[PDB]
PDB file of all heavy atoms in Angstrom:
ATOM      1  N   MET Q 126     -18.929  -0.475  -1.287  1.00 53.25           N
ATOM      2  CA  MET Q 126     -18.132   0.507  -0.601  1.00 53.25           C
ATOM      3  C   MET Q 126     -18.064   1.800  -1.352  1.00 53.25           C
ATOM      4  O   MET Q 126     -18.258   1.858  -2.549  1.00 53.25           O
ATOM      5  CB  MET Q 126     -16.640  -0.126  -0.551  1.00 53.25           C
ATOM      6  CG  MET Q 126     -16.537  -1.459   0.206  1.00 53.25           C
ATOM      7  SD  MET Q 126     -16.918  -1.395   1.807  1.00 53.25           S
ATOM      8  CE  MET Q 126     -18.456  -2.333   1.802  1.00 53.25           C
ATOM      9  N   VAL Q 127     -17.689   2.863  -0.608  1.00 57.70           N
ATOM     10  CA  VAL Q 127     -17.325   4.109  -1.118  1.00 57.70           C
ATOM     11  C   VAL Q 127     -15.799   4.074  -1.356  1.00 57.70           C
ATOM     12  O   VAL Q 127     -15.121   3.715  -0.557  1.00 57.70           O
ATOM     13  CB  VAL Q 127     -17.698   5.234  -0.152  1.00 57.70           C
ATOM     14  CG1 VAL Q 127     -17.140   6.555  -0.671  1.00 57.70           C
ATOM     15  CG2 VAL Q 127     -19.294   5.208   0.005  1.00 57.70           C
ATOM     16  N   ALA Q 128     -15.438   4.437  -2.483  1.00 59.98           N
ATOM     17  CA  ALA Q 128     -14.033   4.558  -2.956  1.00 59.98           C
ATOM     18  C   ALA Q 128     -13.212   5.570  -1.906  1.00 59.98           C
ATOM     19  O   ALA Q 128     -13.790   6.597  -1.641  1.00 59.98           O
ATOM     20  CB  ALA Q 128     -13.753   4.814  -4.319  1.00 59.98           C
ATOM     21  N   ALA Q 129     -11.946   5.300  -1.772  1.00 58.78           N
ATOM     22  CA  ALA Q 129     -10.991   6.252  -1.237  1.00 58.78           C
ATOM     23  C   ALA Q 129     -10.765   7.293  -2.313  1.00 58.78           C
ATOM     24  O   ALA Q 129     -11.003   7.148  -3.464  1.00 58.78           O
ATOM     25  CB  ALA Q 129      -9.717   5.570  -0.841  1.00 58.78           C
ATOM     26  N   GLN Q 130     -10.288   8.497  -1.751  1.00 60.73           N
ATOM     27  CA  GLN Q 130     -10.018   9.655  -2.688  1.00 60.73           C
ATOM     28  C   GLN Q 130      -8.829   9.455  -3.517  1.00 60.73           C
ATOM     29  O   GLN Q 130      -8.755  10.081  -4.643  1.00 60.73           O
ATOM     30  CB  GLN Q 130      -9.768  10.894  -1.857  1.00 60.73           C
ATOM     31  CG  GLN Q 130     -11.030  11.272  -1.101  1.00 60.73           C
ATOM     32  CD  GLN Q 130     -10.750  12.263   0.022  1.00 60.73           C
ATOM     33  OE1 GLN Q 130      -9.626  12.277   0.564  1.00 60.73           O
ATOM     34  NE2 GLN Q 130     -11.717  13.012   0.486  1.00 60.73           N
ATOM     35  N   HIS Q 131      -7.832   8.591  -3.148  1.00 61.30           N
ATOM     36  CA  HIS Q 131      -6.610   8.534  -3.797  1.00 61.30           C
ATOM     37  C   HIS Q 131      -6.331   6.995  -3.943  1.00 61.30           C
ATOM     38  O   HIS Q 131      -6.561   6.199  -3.164  1.00 61.30           O
ATOM     39  CB  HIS Q 131      -5.487   9.174  -2.974  1.00 61.30           C
ATOM     40  CG  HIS Q 131      -5.764  10.643  -2.674  1.00 61.30           C
ATOM     41  ND1 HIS Q 131      -5.597  11.538  -3.602  1.00 61.30           N
ATOM     42  CD2 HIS Q 131      -6.044  11.263  -1.503  1.00 61.30           C
ATOM     43  CE1 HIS Q 131      -5.922  12.763  -3.126  1.00 61.30           C
ATOM     44  NE2 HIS Q 131      -6.239  12.511  -1.820  1.00 61.30           N
ATOM     45  N   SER Q 132      -5.527   6.673  -5.140  1.00 62.98           N
ATOM     46  CA  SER Q 132      -5.219   5.385  -5.428  1.00 62.98           C
ATOM     47  C   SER Q 132      -3.657   5.141  -5.268  1.00 62.98           C
ATOM     48  O   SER Q 132      -2.877   5.913  -5.833  1.00 62.98           O
ATOM     49  CB  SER Q 132      -5.629   4.988  -6.838  1.00 62.98           C
ATOM     50  OG  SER Q 132      -6.960   4.917  -6.955  1.00 62.98           O
ATOM     51  N   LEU Q 133      -3.362   4.075  -4.508  1.00 63.10           N
ATOM     52  CA  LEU Q 133      -1.989   3.612  -4.435  1.00 63.10           C
ATOM     53  C   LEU Q 133      -1.717   2.545  -5.704  1.00 63.10           C
ATOM     54  O   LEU Q 133      -2.536   1.758  -6.018  1.00 63.10           O
ATOM     55  CB  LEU Q 133      -1.738   2.786  -3.189  1.00 63.10           C
ATOM     56  CG  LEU Q 133      -2.155   3.572  -1.859  1.00 63.10           C
ATOM     57  CD1 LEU Q 133      -1.932   2.648  -0.651  1.00 63.10           C
ATOM     58  CD2 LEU Q 133      -1.276   4.812  -1.797  1.00 63.10           C
ATOM     59  N   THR Q 134      -0.529   2.777  -6.219  1.00 62.85           N
ATOM     60  CA  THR Q 134      -0.128   1.776  -7.149  1.00 62.85           C
ATOM     61  C   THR Q 134       1.236   1.185  -6.608  1.00 62.85           C
ATOM     62  O   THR Q 134       1.893   1.764  -5.788  1.00 62.85           O
ATOM     63  CB  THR Q 134       0.004   2.263  -8.656  1.00 62.85           C
ATOM     64  OG1 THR Q 134       0.968   3.297  -8.698  1.00 62.85           O
ATOM     65  CG2 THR Q 134      -1.255   2.837  -9.069  1.00 62.85           C
ATOM     66  N   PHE Q 135       1.579   0.054  -7.242  1.00 64.72           N
ATOM     67  CA  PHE Q 135       2.696  -0.833  -6.690  1.00 64.72           C
ATOM     68  C   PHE Q 135       3.642  -1.207  -7.739  1.00 64.72           C
ATOM     69  O   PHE Q 135       3.299  -1.542  -8.952  1.00 64.72           O
ATOM     70  CB  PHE Q 135       2.122  -2.006  -6.036  1.00 64.72           C
ATOM     71  CG  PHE Q 135       1.197  -1.669  -4.791  1.00 64.72           C
ATOM     72  CD1 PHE Q 135      -0.162  -1.385  -5.065  1.00 64.72           C
ATOM     73  CD2 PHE Q 135       1.805  -1.536  -3.569  1.00 64.72           C
ATOM     74  CE1 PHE Q 135      -1.026  -1.013  -3.887  1.00 64.72           C
ATOM     75  CE2 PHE Q 135       0.976  -1.161  -2.590  1.00 64.72           C
ATOM     76  CZ  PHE Q 135      -0.397  -0.841  -2.721  1.00 64.72           C
ATOM     77  N   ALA Q 136       4.828  -1.252  -7.337  1.00 67.53           N
ATOM     78  CA  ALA Q 136       5.962  -1.734  -8.213  1.00 67.53           C
ATOM     79  C   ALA Q 136       5.807  -3.250  -8.400  1.00 67.53           C
ATOM     80  O   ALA Q 136       5.135  -3.906  -7.584  1.00 67.53           O
ATOM     81  CB  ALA Q 136       7.335  -1.408  -7.611  1.00 67.53           C
ATOM     82  N   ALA Q 137       6.459  -3.876  -9.367  1.00 67.51           N
ATOM     83  CA  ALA Q 137       6.366  -5.300  -9.660  1.00 67.51           C
ATOM     84  C   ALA Q 137       6.777  -6.128  -8.410  1.00 67.51           C
ATOM     85  O   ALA Q 137       6.189  -7.199  -8.204  1.00 67.51           O
ATOM     86  CB  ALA Q 137       7.221  -5.604 -10.844  1.00 67.51           C
ATOM     87  N   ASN Q 138       7.671  -5.659  -7.549  1.00 65.45           N
ATOM     88  CA  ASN Q 138       8.121  -6.333  -6.355  1.00 65.45           C
ATOM     89  C   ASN Q 138       7.169  -6.178  -5.139  1.00 65.45           C
ATOM     90  O   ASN Q 138       7.484  -6.749  -4.160  1.00 65.45           O
ATOM     91  CB  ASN Q 138       9.516  -5.943  -6.002  1.00 65.45           C
ATOM     92  CG  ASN Q 138       9.702  -4.479  -5.659  1.00 65.45           C
ATOM     93  OD1 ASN Q 138       8.749  -3.752  -5.377  1.00 65.45           O
ATOM     94  ND2 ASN Q 138      10.851  -3.988  -5.640  1.00 65.45           N
ATOM     95  N   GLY Q 139       6.206  -5.302  -5.317  1.00 62.23           N
ATOM     96  CA  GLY Q 139       5.184  -5.179  -4.362  1.00 62.23           C
ATOM     97  C   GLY Q 139       5.178  -3.969  -3.475  1.00 62.23           C
ATOM     98  O   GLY Q 139       4.183  -3.658  -2.856  1.00 62.23           O
ATOM     99  N   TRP Q 140       6.399  -3.231  -3.416  1.00 57.56           N
ATOM    100  CA  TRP Q 140       6.337  -2.000  -2.651  1.00 57.56           C
ATOM    101  C   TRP Q 140       5.480  -0.916  -3.340  1.00 57.56           C
ATOM    102  O   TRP Q 140       5.521  -0.803  -4.588  1.00 57.56           O
ATOM    103  CB  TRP Q 140       7.839  -1.440  -2.344  1.00 57.56           C
ATOM    104  CG  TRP Q 140       8.565  -2.267  -1.496  1.00 57.56           C
ATOM    105  CD1 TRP Q 140       9.653  -3.056  -1.737  1.00 57.56           C
ATOM    106  CD2 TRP Q 140       8.234  -2.515  -0.021  1.00 57.56           C
ATOM    107  NE1 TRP Q 140      10.069  -3.719  -0.641  1.00 57.56           N
ATOM    108  CE2 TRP Q 140       9.195  -3.343   0.476  1.00 57.56           C
ATOM    109  CE3 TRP Q 140       7.266  -2.078   0.813  1.00 57.56           C
ATOM    110  CZ2 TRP Q 140       9.235  -3.798   1.783  1.00 57.56           C
ATOM    111  CZ3 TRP Q 140       7.366  -2.411   2.114  1.00 57.56           C
ATOM    112  CH2 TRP Q 140       8.210  -3.286   2.647  1.00 57.56           C
ATOM    113  N   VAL Q 141       4.876  -0.098  -2.495  1.00 57.97           N
ATOM    114  CA  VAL Q 141       4.071   0.999  -3.105  1.00 57.97           C
ATOM    115  C   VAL Q 141       4.958   1.923  -3.821  1.00 57.97           C
ATOM    116  O   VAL Q 141       6.085   2.166  -3.442  1.00 57.97           O
ATOM    117  CB  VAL Q 141       3.295   1.784  -1.919  1.00 57.97           C
ATOM    118  CG1 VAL Q 141       4.200   2.441  -1.004  1.00 57.97           C
ATOM    119  CG2 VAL Q 141       2.180   2.682  -2.536  1.00 57.97           C
ATOM    120  N   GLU Q 142       4.402   2.412  -4.975  1.00 57.90           N
ATOM    121  CA  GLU Q 142       5.104   3.558  -5.652  1.00 57.90           C
ATOM    122  C   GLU Q 142       5.112   4.893  -4.749  1.00 57.90           C
ATOM    123  O   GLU Q 142       4.031   5.291  -4.397  1.00 57.90           O
ATOM    124  CB  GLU Q 142       4.403   3.820  -6.946  1.00 57.90           C
ATOM    125  CG  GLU Q 142       4.798   2.806  -8.006  1.00 57.90           C
ATOM    126  CD  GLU Q 142       6.288   3.000  -8.514  1.00 57.90           C
ATOM    127  OE1 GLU Q 142       6.977   3.971  -8.016  1.00 57.90           O
ATOM    128  OE2 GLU Q 142       6.757   2.121  -9.229  1.00 57.90           O
ATOM    129  N   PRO Q 143       6.248   5.346  -4.343  1.00 56.86           N
ATOM    130  CA  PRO Q 143       6.257   6.357  -3.364  1.00 56.86           C
ATOM    131  C   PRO Q 143       5.489   7.585  -3.694  1.00 56.86           C
ATOM    132  O   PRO Q 143       4.904   8.253  -2.797  1.00 56.86           O
ATOM    133  CB  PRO Q 143       7.704   6.747  -3.210  1.00 56.86           C
ATOM    134  CG  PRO Q 143       8.396   5.477  -3.568  1.00 56.86           C
ATOM    135  CD  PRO Q 143       7.642   4.847  -4.599  1.00 56.86           C
ATOM    136  N   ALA Q 144       5.342   7.967  -4.924  1.00 54.62           N
ATOM    137  CA  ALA Q 144       4.576   9.089  -5.360  1.00 54.62           C
ATOM    138  C   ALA Q 144       3.091   9.039  -5.019  1.00 54.62           C
ATOM    139  O   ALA Q 144       2.354  10.057  -4.786  1.00 54.62           O
ATOM    140  CB  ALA Q 144       4.763   9.389  -6.870  1.00 54.62           C
ATOM    141  N   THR Q 145       2.567   7.845  -4.946  1.00 54.80           N
ATOM    142  CA  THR Q 145       1.192   7.580  -4.680  1.00 54.80           C
ATOM    143  C   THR Q 145       0.821   7.564  -3.146  1.00 54.80           C
ATOM    144  O   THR Q 145      -0.341   7.585  -2.838  1.00 54.80           O
ATOM    145  CB  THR Q 145       0.683   6.323  -5.402  1.00 54.80           C
ATOM    146  OG1 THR Q 145       1.187   5.082  -4.758  1.00 54.80           O
ATOM    147  CG2 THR Q 145       0.957   6.354  -6.872  1.00 54.80           C
ATOM    148  N   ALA Q 146       1.819   7.422  -2.375  1.00 51.26           N
ATOM    149  CA  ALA Q 146       1.677   7.518  -0.874  1.00 51.26           C
ATOM    150  C   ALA Q 146       2.396   8.654  -0.237  1.00 51.26           C
ATOM    151  O   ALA Q 146       3.263   8.482   0.640  1.00 51.26           O
ATOM    152  CB  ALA Q 146       2.217   6.106  -0.362  1.00 51.26           C
ATOM    153  N   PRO Q 147       2.023   9.838  -0.667  1.00 52.01           N
ATOM    154  CA  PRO Q 147       2.713  11.050  -0.063  1.00 52.01           C
ATOM    155  C   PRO Q 147       2.443  11.269   1.391  1.00 52.01           C
ATOM    156  O   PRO Q 147       1.277  11.038   1.872  1.00 52.01           O
ATOM    157  CB  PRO Q 147       2.182  12.206  -0.880  1.00 52.01           C
ATOM    158  CG  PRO Q 147       0.772  11.775  -1.302  1.00 52.01           C
ATOM    159  CD  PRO Q 147       0.946  10.297  -1.597  1.00 52.01           C
ATOM    160  N   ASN Q 148       3.426  11.608   2.135  1.00 52.81           N
ATOM    161  CA  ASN Q 148       3.276  11.977   3.653  1.00 52.81           C
ATOM    162  C   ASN Q 148       2.781  10.848   4.328  1.00 52.81           C
ATOM    163  O   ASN Q 148       2.141  11.070   5.453  1.00 52.81           O
ATOM    164  CB  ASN Q 148       2.384  13.241   3.717  1.00 52.81           C
ATOM    165  CG  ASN Q 148       2.889  14.404   3.008  1.00 52.81           C
ATOM    166  OD1 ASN Q 148       2.393  14.981   2.109  1.00 52.81           O
ATOM    167  ND2 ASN Q 148       4.142  14.839   3.382  1.00 52.81           N
ATOM    168  N   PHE Q 149       3.155   9.675   3.990  1.00 53.69           N
ATOM    169  CA  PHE Q 149       2.739   8.413   4.744  1.00 53.69           C
ATOM    170  C   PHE Q 149       3.628   8.240   6.021  1.00 53.69           C
ATOM    171  O   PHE Q 149       3.390   7.390   6.870  1.00 53.69           O
ATOM    172  CB  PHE Q 149       2.786   7.201   3.915  1.00 53.69           C
ATOM    173  CG  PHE Q 149       1.416   6.859   3.296  1.00 53.69           C
ATOM    174  CD1 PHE Q 149       0.606   7.751   2.650  1.00 53.69           C
ATOM    175  CD2 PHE Q 149       0.915   5.573   3.352  1.00 53.69           C
ATOM    176  CE1 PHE Q 149      -0.596   7.534   2.165  1.00 53.69           C
ATOM    177  CE2 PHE Q 149      -0.375   5.195   2.868  1.00 53.69           C
ATOM    178  CZ  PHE Q 149      -1.107   6.213   2.182  1.00 53.69           C
ATOM    179  N   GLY Q 150       4.651   9.001   6.229  1.00 54.34           N
ATOM    180  CA  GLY Q 150       5.488   8.909   7.379  1.00 54.34           C
ATOM    181  C   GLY Q 150       6.028   7.537   7.597  1.00 54.34           C
ATOM    182  O   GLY Q 150       6.623   6.927   6.767  1.00 54.34           O
ATOM    183  N   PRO Q 151       5.711   6.869   8.784  1.00 56.05           N
ATOM    184  CA  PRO Q 151       6.273   5.584   9.097  1.00 56.05           C
ATOM    185  C   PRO Q 151       5.522   4.457   8.544  1.00 56.05           C
ATOM    186  O   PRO Q 151       5.969   3.282   8.552  1.00 56.05           O
ATOM    187  CB  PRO Q 151       6.156   5.536  10.581  1.00 56.05           C
ATOM    188  CG  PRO Q 151       4.946   6.327  10.931  1.00 56.05           C
ATOM    189  CD  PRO Q 151       5.006   7.510   9.968  1.00 56.05           C
ATOM    190  N   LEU Q 152       4.420   4.692   7.754  1.00 54.87           N
ATOM    191  CA  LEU Q 152       3.619   3.575   7.141  1.00 54.87           C
ATOM    192  C   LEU Q 152       4.248   3.141   5.874  1.00 54.87           C
ATOM    193  O   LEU Q 152       4.350   3.957   4.870  1.00 54.87           O
ATOM    194  CB  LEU Q 152       2.190   4.150   6.857  1.00 54.87           C
ATOM    195  CG  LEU Q 152       1.391   4.593   8.099  1.00 54.87           C
ATOM    196  CD1 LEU Q 152      -0.043   4.814   7.627  1.00 54.87           C
ATOM    197  CD2 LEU Q 152       1.478   3.615   9.211  1.00 54.87           C
ATOM    198  N   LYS Q 153       4.716   1.905   5.823  1.00 54.15           N
ATOM    199  CA  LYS Q 153       5.340   1.287   4.683  1.00 54.15           C
ATOM    200  C   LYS Q 153       4.397   0.316   4.044  1.00 54.15           C
ATOM    201  O   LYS Q 153       4.151  -0.775   4.610  1.00 54.15           O
ATOM    202  CB  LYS Q 153       6.616   0.610   5.221  1.00 54.15           C
ATOM    203  CG  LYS Q 153       7.742   0.471   4.145  1.00 54.15           C
ATOM    204  CD  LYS Q 153       9.119   0.421   4.605  1.00 54.15           C
ATOM    205  CE  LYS Q 153       9.530  -0.998   5.052  1.00 54.15           C
ATOM    206  NZ  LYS Q 153      10.982  -1.268   4.732  1.00 54.15           N
ATOM    207  N   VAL Q 154       3.811   0.634   2.913  1.00 52.85           N
ATOM    208  CA  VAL Q 154       2.790  -0.165   2.282  1.00 52.85           C
ATOM    209  C   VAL Q 154       3.400  -1.061   1.268  1.00 52.85           C
ATOM    210  O   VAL Q 154       4.122  -0.712   0.445  1.00 52.85           O
ATOM    211  CB  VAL Q 154       1.732   0.783   1.677  1.00 52.85           C
ATOM    212  CG1 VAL Q 154       0.527   0.030   1.178  1.00 52.85           C
ATOM    213  CG2 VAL Q 154       1.243   1.821   2.669  1.00 52.85           C
ATOM    214  N   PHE Q 155       2.749  -2.369   1.342  1.00 51.86           N
ATOM    215  CA  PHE Q 155       3.216  -3.455   0.492  1.00 51.86           C
ATOM    216  C   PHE Q 155       2.064  -4.268   0.038  1.00 51.86           C
ATOM    217  O   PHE Q 155       1.259  -4.705   0.746  1.00 51.86           O
ATOM    218  CB  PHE Q 155       4.149  -4.290   1.427  1.00 51.86           C
ATOM    219  CG  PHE Q 155       4.803  -5.522   0.621  1.00 51.86           C
ATOM    220  CD1 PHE Q 155       5.724  -5.355  -0.261  1.00 51.86           C
ATOM    221  CD2 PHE Q 155       4.310  -6.823   1.010  1.00 51.86           C
ATOM    222  CE1 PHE Q 155       6.290  -6.468  -1.028  1.00 51.86           C
ATOM    223  CE2 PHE Q 155       4.884  -7.912   0.260  1.00 51.86           C
ATOM    224  CZ  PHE Q 155       5.899  -7.717  -0.721  1.00 51.86           C
ATOM    225  N   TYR Q 156       2.098  -4.524  -1.357  1.00 50.10           N
ATOM    226  CA  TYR Q 156       1.241  -5.442  -1.903  1.00 50.10           C
ATOM    227  C   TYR Q 156       1.837  -6.834  -1.981  1.00 50.10           C
ATOM    228  O   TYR Q 156       2.754  -6.906  -2.759  1.00 50.10           O
ATOM    229  CB  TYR Q 156       0.815  -4.996  -3.308  1.00 50.10           C
ATOM    230  CG  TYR Q 156      -0.112  -5.919  -4.085  1.00 50.10           C
ATOM    231  CD1 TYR Q 156      -1.352  -6.336  -3.564  1.00 50.10           C
ATOM    232  CD2 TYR Q 156       0.355  -6.590  -5.221  1.00 50.10           C
ATOM    233  CE1 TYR Q 156      -2.165  -7.178  -4.161  1.00 50.10           C
ATOM    234  CE2 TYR Q 156      -0.529  -7.490  -5.818  1.00 50.10           C
ATOM    235  CZ  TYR Q 156      -1.712  -7.796  -5.432  1.00 50.10           C
ATOM    236  OH  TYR Q 156      -2.567  -8.791  -5.988  1.00 50.10           O
ATOM    237  N   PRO Q 157       1.377  -7.827  -1.265  1.00 50.71           N
ATOM    238  CA  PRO Q 157       2.078  -9.120  -1.178  1.00 50.71           C
ATOM    239  C   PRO Q 157       1.674 -10.101  -2.273  1.00 50.71           C
ATOM    240  O   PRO Q 157       2.247 -11.215  -2.446  1.00 50.71           O
ATOM    241  CB  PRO Q 157       1.611  -9.656   0.098  1.00 50.71           C
ATOM    242  CG  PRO Q 157       0.211  -9.150   0.330  1.00 50.71           C
ATOM    243  CD  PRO Q 157       0.217  -7.759  -0.327  1.00 50.71           C
ATOM    244  N   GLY Q 158       0.744  -9.786  -3.137  1.00 47.63           N
ATOM    245  CA  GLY Q 158       0.095 -10.662  -4.118  1.00 47.63           C
ATOM    246  C   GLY Q 158      -1.347 -10.958  -3.627  1.00 47.63           C
ATOM    247  O   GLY Q 158      -1.677 -10.669  -2.528  1.00 47.63           O
ATOM    248  N   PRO Q 159      -2.108 -11.629  -4.491  1.00 48.89           N
ATOM    249  CA  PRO Q 159      -3.490 -11.966  -4.192  1.00 48.89           C
ATOM    250  C   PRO Q 159      -3.608 -13.013  -3.154  1.00 48.89           C
ATOM    251  O   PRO Q 159      -2.806 -14.031  -3.131  1.00 48.89           O
ATOM    252  CB  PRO Q 159      -4.004 -12.497  -5.538  1.00 48.89           C
ATOM    253  CG  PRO Q 159      -2.856 -12.828  -6.295  1.00 48.89           C
ATOM    254  CD  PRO Q 159      -1.694 -11.995  -5.848  1.00 48.89           C
ATOM    255  N   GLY Q 160      -4.578 -12.925  -2.290  1.00 49.02           N
ATOM    256  CA  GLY Q 160      -4.628 -13.903  -1.211  1.00 49.02           C
ATOM    257  C   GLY Q 160      -6.049 -14.025  -0.593  1.00 49.02           C
ATOM    258  O   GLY Q 160      -6.911 -14.574  -1.265  1.00 49.02           O
ATOM    259  N   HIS Q 161      -6.282 -13.314   0.482  1.00 47.80           N
ATOM    260  CA  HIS Q 161      -7.586 -13.124   0.978  1.00 47.80           C
ATOM    261  C   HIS Q 161      -8.504 -12.530   0.001  1.00 47.80           C
ATOM    262  O   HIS Q 161      -9.654 -12.823  -0.212  1.00 47.80           O
ATOM    263  CB  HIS Q 161      -7.490 -12.373   2.294  1.00 47.80           C
ATOM    264  CG  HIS Q 161      -8.838 -11.875   2.759  1.00 47.80           C
ATOM    265  ND1 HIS Q 161      -9.733 -12.664   3.408  1.00 47.80           N
ATOM    266  CD2 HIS Q 161      -9.486 -10.682   2.585  1.00 47.80           C
ATOM    267  CE1 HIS Q 161     -10.844 -11.930   3.651  1.00 47.80           C
ATOM    268  NE2 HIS Q 161     -10.641 -10.707   3.194  1.00 47.80           N
ATOM    269  N   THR Q 162      -8.021 -11.468  -0.769  1.00 46.77           N
ATOM    270  CA  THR Q 162      -8.582 -10.981  -1.887  1.00 46.77           C
ATOM    271  C   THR Q 162      -7.513 -10.582  -2.931  1.00 46.77           C
ATOM    272  O   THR Q 162      -6.360 -10.703  -2.606  1.00 46.77           O
ATOM    273  CB  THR Q 162      -9.413  -9.615  -1.616  1.00 46.77           C
ATOM    274  OG1 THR Q 162      -8.500  -8.716  -1.101  1.00 46.77           O
ATOM    275  CG2 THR Q 162     -10.554  -9.884  -0.752  1.00 46.77           C
ATOM    276  N   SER Q 163      -7.965 -10.281  -4.119  1.00 45.98           N
ATOM    277  CA  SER Q 163      -7.013  -9.868  -5.202  1.00 45.98           C
ATOM    278  C   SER Q 163      -6.305  -8.577  -4.775  1.00 45.98           C
ATOM    279  O   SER Q 163      -5.183  -8.304  -5.259  1.00 45.98           O
ATOM    280  CB  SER Q 163      -7.722  -9.618  -6.517  1.00 45.98           C
ATOM    281  OG  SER Q 163      -8.780  -8.694  -6.386  1.00 45.98           O
ATOM    282  N   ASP Q 164      -6.962  -7.681  -4.057  1.00 46.60           N
ATOM    283  CA  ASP Q 164      -6.596  -6.306  -3.794  1.00 46.60           C
ATOM    284  C   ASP Q 164      -5.932  -6.107  -2.414  1.00 46.60           C
ATOM    285  O   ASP Q 164      -5.431  -4.979  -2.096  1.00 46.60           O
ATOM    286  CB  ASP Q 164      -7.752  -5.294  -3.979  1.00 46.60           C
ATOM    287  CG  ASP Q 164      -8.874  -5.504  -3.042  1.00 46.60           C
ATOM    288  OD1 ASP Q 164      -9.210  -6.714  -2.807  1.00 46.60           O
ATOM    289  OD2 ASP Q 164      -9.465  -4.511  -2.648  1.00 46.60           O
ATOM    290  N   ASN Q 165      -5.798  -7.241  -1.634  1.00 45.00           N
ATOM    291  CA  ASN Q 165      -5.291  -7.010  -0.258  1.00 45.00           C
ATOM    292  C   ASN Q 165      -3.936  -6.302  -0.176  1.00 45.00           C
ATOM    293  O   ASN Q 165      -2.938  -6.847  -0.886  1.00 45.00           O
ATOM    294  CB  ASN Q 165      -5.410  -8.258   0.606  1.00 45.00           C
ATOM    295  CG  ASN Q 165      -4.840  -9.493   0.005  1.00 45.00           C
ATOM    296  OD1 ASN Q 165      -5.239 -10.659   0.387  1.00 45.00           O
ATOM    297  ND2 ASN Q 165      -3.792  -9.413  -0.818  1.00 45.00           N
ATOM    298  N   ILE Q 166      -3.768  -5.382   0.714  1.00 45.71           N
ATOM    299  CA  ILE Q 166      -2.450  -4.783   0.925  1.00 45.71           C
ATOM    300  C   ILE Q 166      -2.106  -4.840   2.456  1.00 45.71           C
ATOM    301  O   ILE Q 166      -2.972  -5.105   3.277  1.00 45.71           O
ATOM    302  CB  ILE Q 166      -2.311  -3.281   0.433  1.00 45.71           C
ATOM    303  CG1 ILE Q 166      -3.424  -2.404   1.042  1.00 45.71           C
ATOM    304  CG2 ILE Q 166      -2.524  -3.339  -1.125  1.00 45.71           C
ATOM    305  CD1 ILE Q 166      -3.188  -0.873   0.673  1.00 45.71           C
ATOM    306  N   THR Q 167      -0.890  -4.572   2.746  1.00 46.71           N
ATOM    307  CA  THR Q 167      -0.252  -4.626   4.104  1.00 46.71           C
ATOM    308  C   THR Q 167       0.518  -3.510   4.388  1.00 46.71           C
ATOM    309  O   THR Q 167       0.896  -2.688   3.588  1.00 46.71           O
ATOM    310  CB  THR Q 167       0.485  -5.990   4.217  1.00 46.71           C
ATOM    311  OG1 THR Q 167       1.553  -5.915   3.289  1.00 46.71           O
ATOM    312  CG2 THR Q 167      -0.316  -7.309   3.862  1.00 46.71           C
ATOM    313  N   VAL Q 168       0.713  -3.277   5.729  1.00 46.29           N
ATOM    314  CA  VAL Q 168       1.481  -2.021   6.160  1.00 46.29           C
ATOM    315  C   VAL Q 168       2.342  -2.310   7.301  1.00 46.29           C
ATOM    316  O   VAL Q 168       1.874  -2.881   8.301  1.00 46.29           O
ATOM    317  CB  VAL Q 168       0.411  -1.010   6.643  1.00 46.29           C
ATOM    318  CG1 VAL Q 168       1.021   0.233   6.929  1.00 46.29           C
ATOM    319  CG2 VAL Q 168      -0.811  -0.903   5.552  1.00 46.29           C
ATOM    320  N   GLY Q 169       3.606  -1.953   7.142  1.00 41.92           N
ATOM    321  CA  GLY Q 169       4.542  -1.945   8.233  1.00 41.92           C
ATOM    322  C   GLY Q 169       4.632  -0.641   8.872  1.00 41.92           C
ATOM    323  O   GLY Q 169       4.424   0.457   8.285  1.00 41.92           O
ATOM    324  N   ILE Q 170       5.015  -0.580  10.098  1.00 39.46           N
ATOM    325  CA  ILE Q 170       5.175   0.694  10.945  1.00 39.46           C
ATOM    326  C   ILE Q 170       6.535   0.896  11.277  1.00 39.46           C
ATOM    327  O   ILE Q 170       7.063   0.323  12.192  1.00 39.46           O
ATOM    328  CB  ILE Q 170       4.271   0.819  12.078  1.00 39.46           C
ATOM    329  CG1 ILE Q 170       2.831   0.458  11.830  1.00 39.46           C
ATOM    330  CG2 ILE Q 170       4.407   2.257  12.745  1.00 39.46           C
ATOM    331  CD1 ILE Q 170       1.962   0.448  12.997  1.00 39.46           C
ATOM    332  N   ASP Q 171       7.272   1.699  10.511  1.00 42.23           N
ATOM    333  CA  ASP Q 171       8.685   2.045  10.756  1.00 42.23           C
ATOM    334  C   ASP Q 171       8.784   2.588  12.220  1.00 42.23           C
ATOM    335  O   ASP Q 171       8.005   3.362  12.611  1.00 42.23           O
ATOM    336  CB  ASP Q 171       9.262   3.010   9.807  1.00 42.23           C
ATOM    337  CG  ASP Q 171       9.444   2.407   8.420  1.00 42.23           C
ATOM    338  OD1 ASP Q 171       9.376   1.143   8.299  1.00 42.23           O
ATOM    339  OD2 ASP Q 171       9.640   3.194   7.373  1.00 42.23           O
ATOM    340  N   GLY Q 172       9.921   2.323  12.851  1.00 40.33           N
ATOM    341  CA  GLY Q 172      10.236   2.723  14.174  1.00 40.33           C
ATOM    342  C   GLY Q 172       9.622   1.755  15.241  1.00 40.33           C
ATOM    343  O   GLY Q 172       9.681   2.129  16.442  1.00 40.33           O
ATOM    344  N   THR Q 173       8.940   0.732  14.762  1.00 42.94           N
ATOM    345  CA  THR Q 173       8.280  -0.210  15.708  1.00 42.94           C
ATOM    346  C   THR Q 173       8.569  -1.662  15.193  1.00 42.94           C
ATOM    347  O   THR Q 173       9.229  -1.882  14.172  1.00 42.94           O
ATOM    348  CB  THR Q 173       6.689  -0.115  15.718  1.00 42.94           C
ATOM    349  OG1 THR Q 173       6.159  -0.743  14.584  1.00 42.94           O
ATOM    350  CG2 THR Q 173       6.352   1.409  15.833  1.00 42.94           C
TER     351      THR Q 173
END
C-alpha cells in the first residue's frame, strides 16, 4: 500500500487523539483493539 499523509494515534481507551484527527466533523474514530488486523480502526458518524 501507499501510506496516508497523516497518522492517527489513539488513547489507551481506544478513542482517537483529537489533535491527530483535525476537522473530522461527525467522524468519530475508535481503535477497538487487534482483531481482523492489528491496525484495524472503526468510525462512528455523529448525527446518525
